[PDB]
Ligand binder design. Structure first.
Ligand code: LYA
Ligand code: LYA
Ligand code: UMP
Ligand code: UMP
Lengths: 286, 286
């Protein structure tokens, strides 16, 4: 079904992908330019050939929406996925010695809600500052769904030098037709073993959310990869996953009627019928 | 061959695309999310089922590279393609009455070379201001071709309100492997009848240029569409073009060794073996 698109890319990268060195010191097999279409109609694409950490997914999205750039605010929810890039050693290796541990800089959250804003620290008050792309999107979908410019962009050339790690999912666009909402994302860099499974579920979630607030039904989620790679220490685990057979995707039900996107809380959502294969550990390249 | 990928999209949009209204008042048949891979190896993808206005293509690219945002500077080269969006009526319909005719605002050129810069007018001196993404790319390709962040982004959330028409080709990323350079582009909006044929040739040209300056051979050009559409008054002309049979793509020869990307002049290039079908007129939706 849909999960076959992902499994296909994993295999393609493995057979043809060229070996390439990366900034983390690990090895890589990569391909440049791919695209997969995931349907959000009566199903949510949460991989089944492996049990995905749904919690961190939901928690991360929520963390993004409130415009936070502090690894600690997320680690507080039991989702440690960003701590690594917020460490003292990592911050220092980038020359951010004066920065407080946990401050990722002007990344995802900050750009979605305050693009123009002049960044200070992970604790500054930015309200009212910069452009709020998220809200902007919502309003355009509501007043003119034919608009060919419903875009949310995290890539900010001017702020790059202060980011602990530039956006991998740097740009997404929404589209409307027949009362159903679709979203496409441009991911410059894609760690097929870890981030990608997360990424896919993260945007399918965002779409559902916005579709809810706008009174539209989810359409498709187009995933576009730039540098899609499989780290060397992910090759064996992936080889096994490729052998497992997928199951039908689960469903995402929203337990309540929400008006503003900032109202959503972890409790408002619930996954149904998720029957995945056993978990698979994979080491994140730092 | 390669031109078949394009012809395929035209047909797919026609037989499966949904009718959709657009900002120009014209009608539209659209699809959301597509991708085509064009090879730049010993061939330049300049459509053959129709004779493409190569001049405007080359002239436009050059116009972009020097960071100009004035329709008149291009109309001066005999390429009138942008005049329409720089008119007084159009500028005024957007509320830009105080703006001088021809000033498109902070678009393509301005963002490629001065992303951060604070826009003034199509005649202001921006040198030394904002980030120069173009040069940035060149240097990264030269010092670390494994870099997973070689990106040039025109989409600037903060400047949007001042653009006569937001970027259609809003983001592209480069990739290197085996001494050959590839480029992928994200085009949020795609007028299949006019712009797209231009767009494709425009980026294939840019790639060739950068590959030359960096001492690499062209690889592939991945074209990714967001809202790909065929305007209603383009349906009949396209239906005929779909019936014509493609010919082998021509070759792009660079008549001279160039060091800096700003040195390139229209004369440095030459197309060879271009044998296309007769021209096809199509009215641009304003
Ligand atoms: N190299 C690299 N790749 C990335 O994708 C990345 C990111 C993106 C977020 C991210 C990081 C790790 C995991 C993750 O580790 N997931 C695991 C376990 C998660 C847990 O339970 O804590 C998984 O198997 O899904 C899932 C998502 C930040 N820094 C990164 N660096
Ligand atoms: N709706 C819309 N589509 C676009 O592509 C666009 C653009 C891109 C620039 C552009 C405009 C017109 C033609 C063009 O007219 N090309 C003709 C021949 C032109 C000539 O003879 O000079 C063609 O057949 O390709 C080719 C390129 C700006 N505003 C636009 N609005
Ligand atoms: C980044 C964040 C995300 O959401 N998705 C991802 O897969 N990644 C991965 C890609 C790469 O491994 C690393 C970022 O490295 P780089 O900046 O591209 O060099 O995280
Ligand atoms: C914009 C510029 C370009 O180079 N390529 C294109 O084909 N276009 C087209 C897309 C769309 O048809 C129109 C812009 O309209 P809108 O801003 O999306 O409303 O020009």
């Amino acid at each position: 079904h849909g999960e076959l698109q992902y499994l296909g890319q994993i295999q393609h990268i493995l057979r043809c992908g060229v070996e390439k060195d990366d900034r983390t010191g690990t090895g890589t097999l990569s391909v440049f330019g791919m695209q997969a279409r995931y349907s959000l109609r009566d199903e949510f694409p949460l991989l089944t050939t492996k049990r995905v950490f749904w919690k961190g997914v939901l928690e991360e999205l929520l963390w993004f929406i409130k415009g936070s750039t502090n690894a600690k605010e997320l680690s507080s929810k039991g989702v440690k996925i960003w701590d690594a890039n917020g460490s003292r050693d990592f911050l220092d290796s980038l020359g951010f010695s004066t920065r407080e541990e946990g401050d990722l800089g002007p990344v995802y959250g900050f750009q979605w809600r305050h693009f123009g804003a002049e960044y200070r620290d992970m604790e500054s008050d930015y309200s009212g500052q910069g452009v709020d792309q998220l809200q902007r999107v919502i309003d355009t979908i509501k007043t003119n769904p034919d608009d060919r410019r419903i875009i949310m962009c995290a890539w900010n050339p001017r702020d790059l030098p202060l980011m602990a790690l530039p956006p991998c999912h740097a740009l997404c666009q929404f589209y409307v037709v027949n009362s159903e909402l679709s979203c496409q994302l441009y991911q410059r860099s894609g760690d097929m073993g870890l981030g990608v499974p997360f990424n896919i579920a993260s945007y399918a979630l965002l779409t559902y959310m916005i579709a809810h607030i706008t009174g539209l039904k989810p359409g498709d989620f187009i995933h576009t990869l730039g540098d899609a790679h499989i780290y060397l220490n992910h090759i064996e685990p992936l080889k096994i996953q490729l052998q497992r057979e997928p199951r039908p995707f689960p469903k995402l039900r929203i337990l309540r009627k929400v008006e503003k996107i900032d109202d959503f809380k972890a409790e408002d959502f619930q996954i149904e019928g998720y029957n995945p294969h056993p978990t698979i550990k994979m080491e994140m390249a730092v």
